[PDB]
Write a protein that binds this ligand. Sequence first.
Ligand SMILES: Nc1ncnc2[nH]cnc12
Ligand SMILES: Nc1ncnc2[nH]cnc12
Lengths: 338, 338
Amino acid sequence: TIKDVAKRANVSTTTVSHVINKTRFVAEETRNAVWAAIKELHYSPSAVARSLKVNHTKSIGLLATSSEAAYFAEIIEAVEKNCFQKGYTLILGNAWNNLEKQRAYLSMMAQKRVDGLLVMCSEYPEPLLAMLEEYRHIPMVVMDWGEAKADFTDAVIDNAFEGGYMAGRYLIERGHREIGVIPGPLEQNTGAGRLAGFMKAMEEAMIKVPESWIVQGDFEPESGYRAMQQILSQPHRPTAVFCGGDIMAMGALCAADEMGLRVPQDVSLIGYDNVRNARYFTPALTTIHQPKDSLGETAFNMLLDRIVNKREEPQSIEVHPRLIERRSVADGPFRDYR
Amino acid sequence: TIKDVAKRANVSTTTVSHVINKTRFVAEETRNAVWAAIKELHYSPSAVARSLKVNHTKSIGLLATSSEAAYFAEIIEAVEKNCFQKGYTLILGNAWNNLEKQRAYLSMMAQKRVDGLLVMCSEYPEPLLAMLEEYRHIPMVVMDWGEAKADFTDAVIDNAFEGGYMAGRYLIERGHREIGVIPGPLEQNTGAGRLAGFMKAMEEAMIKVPESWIVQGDFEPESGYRAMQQILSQPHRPTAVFCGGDIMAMGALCAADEMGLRVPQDVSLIGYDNVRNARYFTPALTTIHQPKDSLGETAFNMLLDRIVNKREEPQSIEVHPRLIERRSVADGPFRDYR
DNA sequence: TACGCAAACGTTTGCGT
DNA sequence: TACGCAAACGTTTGCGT
Ligand SMILES: Nc1ncnc2[nH]cnc12
Ligand SMILES: Nc1ncnc2[nH]cnc12
């Protein structure tokens, strides 16, 4: 079809190409006509064709887990923002922690010849790690590991452990000593990681958390509801609770209200993520904030580096969580005794 | 690189191709070797190359507005689900209601040669309609219009008006006659549409809504907070409020709590959307539910039809909202008098 | 000076035999 | 019977002149 344009303009396609890509000098005169034709012909340069010669599609694939969950959602939108301004095209794929689904999208991606790969799989078993490696050839970065699980990728690490530790400390310094927790899937970094961080703070305080006070969640509002319930649904209950994620917390808030418990007057709740609208939780959620934007930006960045500056050596960049004081927590019984 | 495979197997690439695509019969023997090589060579058929001959990329572009907002998010995830199972690749682009941004993504899309186009732009001014038409050639469907704005697209219509009407009716039948409303951007269908529907119910009831009781929102939690405030922040206030979107409502809930108002005992609130987690609002939100999944499914479907069955004539498919009773509403002063 | 030729990028596919 | 040839799809780009 460029052939069709070169003709209208009565010049070589090479020429057409050159003016389209400003890749060498062209007569104004000449230039014009081409555009002229480019317009009537209503021309649209085929990227697939181009991508065929130039050897880069100028698009990146997001091998995600899910994309609705507030958390995930924020990141994605971030990453995308980046792709847009640097000319990249985002190909979004949720794998739902389904291996087949993952091997699937992966290969679809390779075939669509993605310039690079962003990875947010939540859980990383050997079987997944393995598949992953078969694609080392294609530049990639995993945005959700605690440490550097592999040598073939760039990694961005959130410090979820120091975040767990922060959340715990706060409780302590507020007077709390009877504290429960609803962690997220221990196979995930944001799960095991955050929890552990929180658990260290307790040991430092010689605070023991009775097993009946820790209930697993999965990050979905419902998981929180159940746990919160289960916790306050017992003879003896904590005076403060640490919730591994904002949404689940939102779930733990609802349930307390429903058991007619008061927050924070009856129970104190600290969450984790600081999702765009935790502020509008009732009451306004006190939580640890994860820098989701920077997280995305930093991932798309390391990736571009590898891409353009053809880097070979794996990289890894830390990012830092931080406490956000809201209205869901209140001084515990030992505040004044410290 | 297929050339590299044909060689290992010592057969024609045509052959390699044939066994890869099961496009004609091949000796088991022959078949094997190819795979054999296909494996060692660690081969990955280039879709760009293929897409070049076959003339279809097997990917669809989502020209969205935003992708974080719960609403949007749910849809997208839906649509994507569909693309995955029918082999399509999703290219997601948020235009933020920025014309340039839109013309941009659009053309990027055309160039990436998308098999079809899904459109969720929120607002549609002539300038946007116009650009849009320049792409009639590429099959497309707009998932957020009230009626059929154009003749060159397939449309799926939500019936947001009948939804507004439903929400109003409910209030009425619950005993309410003093009711306020926080609508969303009147330029959007889910804005003007829903409101109007609600407004008809009032006229039918000879209920007049004083201007001081209607406050625009933008769908973001914050907009709701302000409005809710503004409303209850007056000498005379409604006994019930209709909120154009769940998130904003969530915002209107927070504010009441903060002005120490009780919901629903002090104010009744009905929202709109029934987002995945409105159930976990505090209190559990009573709202109108939009079938977001079916919405996506139905869009990806009409689109596939056009695509595959090369349809030419625009189509349009209705979808229906429905009331979801929760805990945010309570009988008003006239319940017993009817 | 300002431009055009033709090979190449990696596939699929109509004819053949 | 089971397979191979070669043209084509739409670009970019190293040489030329
Ligand atoms: N996997 C996950 N899902 C939702 N919110 C999260 N916060 C941290 N990890 C998360
Ligand atoms: N544009 C929009 N944003 C968020 N929620 C919505 N519900 C209906 N339309 C919406």
